[PDB]
């Protein structure tokens, strides 16, 4: 069925729907409301509620104003990411990333959540900047927000390190920190990824003690377990 | 030099490198290495960058230089005085550095006193990234088993990288992508 | 500008702000010298490999230095310059190859 191998390669490497059925479901994945309203939630009220939460966030913290200009304007209310060019898309991705790194501080707050919901239902951040959002939500991995995001995540879109959350997607309960650390011990790539994320944040001077405590704890337990693996007895393999 | 005109680059037994305009048969420039304790240039190769060369001294440093400004660009304590780097090759792909496989600037260095090849990631300040330990058989003077590594090429544009040694063996190795690989895996061999 | 600010606000309101959204998204001398390369020139159009590096449909005979600059341009367009072409105790420790013996 080598044909079918090729085709499913393409079809999960898709980025835009083309039958109405996959369109409706792709629109109905969302965080706050239910699918059976989010289907026919049109593109004003989404911007309405989310911009309200955005105002709350901007009055709390200062440096959100360029994101106000560029990612929440009324033309952004209908920009269709699906039809720009690649370098545009990447610049957009950079803007997306920096916004996530700033917002992940105030994550237990409803206006922040609303802001991310805007990002998802418009730019499909969960589909096209998957690894970043999963990265910036991993620190809060015990919370109802994380489980809901876990629900709406697209499976084959999950980055290759983070694929290990699939049985939790099959069973919508949050994973616990021991599960995370065990995958962290086995792989180098997940640990490299978490460290590179949080390094990007603190390079950006956007870190915060919860995230740093998270990262330190996970790195420490991972390195403990890794030396537990690397012990050999045999001189050369230990070296 | 990839884009220079009728110039060849020769190295000396002394640590010097001499640029020769081969058109009229004229020595046109000579260059010297920093910290003259490094003795003899062992191997040299032009980078994918512009005007940028890798000289390798027996004394242990590699160096890469702007061969028209004669300013050091990177310096590497890259061989021992016992183990001199004797053939290198740069990857020309576009991806493979910065601990995420996305960035470029990877190079491979080889001696002939060992059989283990080494991969640097150039990007921040030129860190090491890995060692294909014992690609060929490790050479030994007391042992009947021949060893030692002849040359390494990163073939252009592709992440394959061909090695051969003394011990009648030609192997080829490749980086994957979706697991990032520090050290490659073997994807042909003939022995 | 010859426009009023509230008029531009209207232009925002009804025509949209598409282009401005796009813009808001998109917010060593040579040590040695040669003489013979000055002395050289080359028939570009007479070459076929070197046809693609001219400027107009008039350049055929170009001096060595300029020809070289064209060649460097084509090297750039063919293989763009990597960014590493543009101290810490531990980073030095990493970058030293002597700290990896067995």
């Amino acid at each position: 069925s080598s044909l079918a191998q090729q085709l499913a390669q393409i079809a999960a490497n898709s980025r835009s729907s083309f039958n109405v059925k996959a369109l409706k479901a792709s629109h109905s994945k969302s965080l706050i409301w239910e699918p059976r309203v989010a289907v026919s939630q049109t593109f004003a009220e989404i911007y309405s509620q989310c911009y309200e939460g955005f105002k709350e966030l901007c009055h709390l913290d200062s440096r959100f104003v360029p994101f106000d200009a560029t990612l929440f304007s009324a033309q952004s209310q209908e920009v269709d990411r699906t039809q720009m060019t690649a370098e545009e898309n990447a610049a957009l991705d950079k803007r997306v990333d920096s916004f996530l790194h700033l917002v992940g501080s105030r994550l237990r707050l409803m206006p922040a959540i609303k802001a991310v919901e805007w990002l998802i239902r418009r730019f499909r951040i969960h589909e096209f900047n998957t690894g970043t959002l999963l990265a910036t939500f991993l620190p809060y991995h015990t919370i109802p927000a994380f489980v809901t995001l876990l629900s709406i995540l697209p499976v084959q879109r999950i980055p290759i390190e983070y694929r290990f959350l699939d049985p939790y997607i099959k069973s919508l309960t949050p994973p616990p920190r021991a599960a995370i650390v065990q995958q962290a011990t086995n792989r180098p790539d997940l640990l490299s990824a978490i460290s590179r994320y949080t390094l990007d944040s603190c390079r950006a001077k956007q870190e915060y003690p919860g995230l740093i405590s998270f990262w330190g704890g996970i790195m420490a337990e991972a390195v403990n377990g890794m030396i537990d693996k690397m012990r050999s007895g045999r001189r050369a393999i230990q070296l | 030099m990839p884009t220079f005109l009728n110039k060849i680059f020769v190295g000396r037994k002394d640590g010097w490198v001499e640029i020769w305009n081969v058109s009229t048969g004229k020595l046109i420039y000579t260059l010297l290495p920093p910290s003259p304790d490094c003795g003899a240039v062992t191997c040299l190769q032009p980078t994918p960058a512009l005007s940028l060369l890798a000289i390798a001294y027996s004394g242990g440093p590699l160096v890469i230089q702007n061969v028209l400004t004669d300013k050091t660009v990177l310096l590497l304590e890259a061989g021992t005085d016992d183990a001199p780097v004797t053939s290198i090759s740069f990857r020309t792909d576009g991806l493979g550095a910065g601990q995420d496989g996305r960035k470029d600037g990877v190079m491979a260095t080889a001696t002939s006193v060992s059989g283990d090849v080494t991969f640097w990631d150039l990007n921040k300040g030129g860190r090491i990234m890995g060692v294909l330990r014992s690609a060929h058989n490790p050479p030994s003077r007391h042992n009947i088993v021949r060893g030692g590594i002849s040359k390494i090429e990163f073939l252009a544009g592709q992440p394959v990288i061909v090695t051969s040694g003394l011990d009648n063996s030609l192997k080829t190795w490749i980086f994957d992508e979706s697991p990032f690989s520090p050290v490659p895996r073997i994807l042909h061999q003939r022995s | 500008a010859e426009k009023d600010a509230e008029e531009e606000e209207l232009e925002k309101f009804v025509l949209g702000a598409k282009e401005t959204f796009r813009e808001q998204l998109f917010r060593d001398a040579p040590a040695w010298e040669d003489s013979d390369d000055e002395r050289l020139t080359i028939s570009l159009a007479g070459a076929t490999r070197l046809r693609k590096l001219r400027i107009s449909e008039s350049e055929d005979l170009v001096s060595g230095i300029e020809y070289a600059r064209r060649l460097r341009q084509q090297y750039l367009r063919l293989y763009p310059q990597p960014d590493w072409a543009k101290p810490l105790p531990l980073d030095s420790f990493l970058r030293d190859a002597n700290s990896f013996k067995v």
Binding site: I160, R163 | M1, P2, T3, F4, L5, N6, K7, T92, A156, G157, Q158, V160, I174, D176, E177, S178, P179, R185, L187 | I42, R49, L50, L71, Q74, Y75, L78, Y79
Partner: peptide, 22 residues
């Protein structure tokens, strides 16, 4: 299984031919 690598495809790569340093 994810993470196990694909075929080896020779990638269509153009390099700088160097027979023009005359």
């Amino acid at each position: 299984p994810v993470g196990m690598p694909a075929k080896w495809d020779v990638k269509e790569a153009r390099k700088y031919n160097i027979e023009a340093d005359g």
